[PDB]
């Protein structure tokens, strides 16, 4: 009963995703390349591994451009393994909507990865897509 | 002497604006497609004019589902004008970017639209842009 977060997922196609071997800086470049502030994280295989966040690649956030610089030049040799969070809170396409968006409240990712039976990353729920959900549903008798 | 707004800006043909006459619906659409959380205000000529985000036109911060479809339900009729904040703080593509840098944490829409002398949007400094900048900065050197 009801909508189903495979409805308003953000498909794989549009997904940014990184590894545990990534190097921070390209993260950190995606992330700006991107304009987002999360991403889910994979292995060679698109199992979802993880979910690493400017806050984790940019950890001590900054307040000051030197600040911010002093972050960046420390950035050199590490990996997006180190500094992820493994095991994130997921959901499944088939997951009703309304649970979903409760749940996106409770990570702070604030997104939910989807993933499939297999666990490979499918597409993502982000708070936009929800919203998205609801302006739709409006839309209609 | 040093790096300058200008040159790390996002340009006006990757803004997403809004003007005050703009529906709430419509504004949050956009919020959703182009996945940004907050949006420029412009009038007709291109005069930056206030800036508006998710948690100004979705507040009459949403937990569950069922509280953002009483929202979303509540925002026929309403416009952007009622809910932006008009006269916000800006930069000038001359601007120091590390003045700059240290602005955009003083205001809550955590962005600073960048005008030009006739106080036209021509593009918007976003923290993403900042991290970028340190990132070039260090690339070369």
């Given at each position: 009963t009801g909508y189903t977060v495979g409805d308003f997922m953000t498909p794989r196609q549009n997904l940014h995703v990184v590894k545990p071997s990534t190097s921070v800086d390209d993260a950190l470049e995606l992330l700006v390349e991107k304009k987002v502030t999360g991403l889910p994280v994979?292995?060679?295989?698109?199992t979802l591994v993880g979910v690493v966040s400017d806050y984790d690649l940019l950890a001590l956030t900054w307040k000051t451009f030197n600040e911010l610089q002093k972050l960046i030049s420390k950035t050199y040799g590490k990996v997006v393994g180190d500094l992820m969070t493994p095991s994130?809170?997921?959901?499944?396409?088939?997951?009703?909507?309304?649970?979903?968006?409760?749940?996106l409240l409770e990570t702070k990712f604030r997104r939910l990865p989807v993933v499939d039976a297999d666990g490979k990353l499918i597409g993502i729920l982000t708070r936009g897509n929800v919203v998205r959900a609801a302006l739709q549903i409006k839309r209609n008798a």
């Amino acid at each position: 009963t009801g909508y189903t977060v495979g409805d308003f997922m953000t498909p794989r196609q549009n997904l940014h995703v990184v590894k545990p071997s990534t190097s921070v800086d390209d993260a950190l470049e995606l992330l700006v390349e991107k304009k987002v502030t999360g991403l889910p994280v994979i292995d060679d295989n698109w199992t979802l591994v993880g979910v690493v966040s400017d806050y984790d690649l940019l950890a001590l956030t900054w307040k000051t451009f030197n600040e911010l610089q002093k972050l960046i030049s420390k950035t050199y040799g590490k990996v997006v393994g180190d500094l992820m969070t493994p095991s994130p809170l997921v959901v499944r396409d088939s997951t009703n909507l309304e649970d979903a968006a409760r749940l996106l409240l409770e990570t702070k990712f604030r997104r939910l990865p989807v993933v499939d039976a297999d666990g490979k990353l499918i597409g993502i729920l982000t708070r936009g897509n929800v919203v998205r959900a609801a302006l739709q549903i409006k839309r209609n008798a």
